[model samples]
Target: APAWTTFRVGLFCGIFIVLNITLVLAAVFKLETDRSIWPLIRIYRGGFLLIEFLFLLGINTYGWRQAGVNHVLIFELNPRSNLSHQHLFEIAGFLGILWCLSLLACFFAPISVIPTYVYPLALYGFMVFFLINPTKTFYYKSRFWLLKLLFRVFTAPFHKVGFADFWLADQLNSLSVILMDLEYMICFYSLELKWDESKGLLPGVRAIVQCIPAWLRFIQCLRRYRDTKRAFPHLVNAGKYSTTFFMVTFAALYSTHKERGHSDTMVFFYLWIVFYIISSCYTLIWDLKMDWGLFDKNAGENTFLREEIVYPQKAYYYCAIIEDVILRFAWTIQISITSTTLLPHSGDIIATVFAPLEVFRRFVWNFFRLENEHLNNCGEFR
Candidate 1:
């Protein structure tokens, strides 16, 4: 039994490592050579990461259960740990605080920089508080609310950077808010499911429902790509930008992880800054590529007509709009599902596997909603 358990754990670890490597290689290949395979590669990459994280979480929880600790388990034990199980749980709890802080820095910070400072500062503050009085309410509710406030505050700057059109900005902001919430919820769910097995069946059911939006978006994106190809074959190359974006993000993440262990704070900060800048650059590039394709630049006196062709007409125009909406919605759903269902129950491995589905579902939902909303709203307006 001991040997079997060891083998099982090893198998899970091996699978996660292989999946992550495959995702990285696939992303690199798509960026360097074949852009057409990007969507598939991205789906796999996200899905695998989710699975790996969740598995680690489960192992951590098992350790806590063995130690007779009342705390929620959130990290796997180090192979070299000689501490009691309860002590290990305490250490895991401390790491959980750091993890939460790191997440905030990653997704919600005002400054797009390395999270090293944030993690240490937050961890120190948490340790001081816990040592004085370790309370469950303080650990769960107080920290939760504090992080929620930080997330909102962090996004405030983004509101000012985008276009001045309030209507457009509000719509985009709503989507952003939803996605952020989803991200938190998915992470929370992953942890919850791992530590608390009583909620087992619920996680599985939620995971399925959460995946719907991503799958929809994926299909919608493909349809739009096809339409673009048919209308303007030359411009159909825009799909390559998505692959390039993924490649840049993957490289940034990998480099950040590699340099995190080094003792030189300056070096770590420099790399973090570089990663942030590269990520932002990729975002801008993606936006430009998308906008240029959806707007007709050469339209003359018949500019309005040409613009209409690029905006809402049949073929590529309508398809593009549909694709965008679906993509945005799918992301929101993906984050939510990841937080609430997949993360809590399955660990990182299963959650990551389902990530691509989130994107795909967004496209699908967009297509369906476009058709429905057009019939309803357009007819009313006309």
Candidate 2:
């Protein structure tokens, strides 16, 4: 396809999405009759936002390849049949179209004769069906490849840790927040439970659900340790993920203490604050010094960046470093606001907002991360 094809398709997608948003808002106020539907939006929007960021990451992948990052090698994909970034743009646009249609279906449900939730359910079902489709509809090879990667991640530590495996694990870690939404979605629809009824149970298990990605990566670290027999970085890497688990534990504890009005609620708050800072600083340093391979001893002209810089522009490197620093401490936004009681959904709202922010940070992080990996590949060959 020509460049105009992508341009026109994306342009129309933007227009359609804008029109749908206007209609959705109109429907919300026009028929504000039912509060029942709001819960579906609440539960589904997080997953939707997760996909939206996936699209952003796809664009980042395009930029990576254009800059000669050798992402196909880093991701360990079949270069022969790998989907180009344009394909990713098309997929994103296709999904956007279906999503808007689903939203319209829900909004127009008052005049229709079907179940209200079935629209979103149908959209989810179509995605699953498309992904698992037996025949070569779109790109079955790539689909199966991803499915295999997903299976590998789910059953981590059983198989040898490939670059692709750990990379997917890292992506899962970035997407950790949305797991709770899916867990609740399954319980909400499959188990056929009410909003408040299901939400009551989330507190008991939400931390565990949120920590799942960290657990996967944590065990992947141990798996690497078992393979390598060197406990330096692997064990330390496991400890890094372990910090996340502890942060989640303290968050749950702080929430519990807050509800009970205990003086030690402040105790848990301060504990969480300390752990939060430690975790951010730890991961931020690892991102700069390890994953990105920045702050190099041999960075003569590049200064804080590495020797074999791939991106050319030094400003991007500095900007990304500053961006990572600021986003690493993004939770400060959550901690500073002490009006959780006044705004009941404020915590959820902040979590929802930051999910995309973290994803965007990962998107920016991926560029230099892969560039560094590509530069290091020469040494690996020796």
Candidate 3:
């Protein structure tokens, strides 16, 4: 090999080793900012770690440092060449470097400056970009995992950013903008919206964070319509109505009874969480059904709406599984949080005590009254 080529290969090989070691350490010790986290959080984090490992493996095992960021373009140039392995190595290097930076950012800067929640979400957004890059990403036709099901609910809309590969939404991979939006609302309210000039531009920031979620959804409704058509509009309206309705109610509560007691406000916030989950699933199903109806009606394939369309058949099946997981997880988060202030229970503890149930929760109803055959039927999970 030439000197420059050998040197570049050595560099990425070392980087791959470092990342692998870090993952092993993180997993073995449960090394996160706070060890206490939801199981679903683990699902997302573990999936990303596995993704980086595969990318890095491609670097060492398949030789990807040759083309770097130009790999995809190179592949297009040689659309039917035998040098494809070296061309795709660039992807491994590019995505590996991104994963490395985002993971390192989690360990730096004081919590006073950066919120604790940003790290995982930042990592998640990057992983979403990875998916939308290489494939026509839609729900799995049949084979799937449950926690993976959880993430798809939050991210699937961003996949339809365009008709081509590598074209994703602007904020789909944006970490800083997302963190900035969330940190303000969380810190602003956690501090009870009190003005502290010592806190820098945070109060100034709060004014914008409140609108970020709604604004992002509006943009999604606009852009994804280019791909999915009118099927998305109704769900967008439902989400907007629900969000605006409660947002105003919560603001009114803050202005009036916030000082007296936040009992009513807390109740309302939890109610919105439930409504948000329900509304999101409703939006997703509504869109899927709309697609099924439109295609069957137009294509003259009119052989049973949802059960016939390829997308909706898989989607309808996945919806049942996802709705099961989302509703349970939502209720668990709300499980121990009641309005009774005098009750004095640590709502967080409910999660700890209930974590074991998750390992079995997926299989509970599947195995409830079934015979030994259902249990013994070689990975035939519902």
Off by over 4 Å in 2: 1-16, 19-38, 190-203, 261-263, 331-345, 377-382
1 against 3, candidate with superior TM-score: 3
Residue pairs whose backbone atoms clash in candidate 2: none
Q: Which ten residues in a row have the lowest lDDT in candidate 2?
A: 195-204
User: Model 3, 1-382: lDDT tens per residue?
Assistant: 3465455545665775687577557656654544433322332333343444344334432322331223323212223332333323444454555555555444333357665446555665665655544443422221122233334324645544321111112122111123332353355436743433212222123323433333444455554455546644434543643453344344434434545675675666666456555644553443234311222344344433322222223454345445544544443232222111222356434433343333223222222112111222211122
Q: Mind giving the per-residue lDDT tens digits that candidate 1 earns over 271-344?
A: 54454344345333332333323333665644322332212335543454455544543343334433332224
Q: Estimate candidate 3's alpha-carbon lDDT, on a 0 to 1 scale.
A: 0.38
How accurate locally is residue 344 in candidate 1, as Cα lDDT from 0 to 100?
A: 42
Measured against the true structure, the TM-scores of the candidates, in listed sequence, are 0.23, 0.86, 0.36
> lDDT of each model, Cα atoms only?
0.35, 0.72, 0.38
Off by over 4 Å in 3: 1-18, 26-93, 101-213, 219-263, 266-274, 291-382
Residue runs of model 1 more than 4 Å from their true location after superposition: 1-180, 186-248, 251-382
Looking at candidate 3, the ten consecutive residues that score lowest on lDDT are: 162-171
Q: What is the lDDT of residue 333 in candidate 2?
A: 39
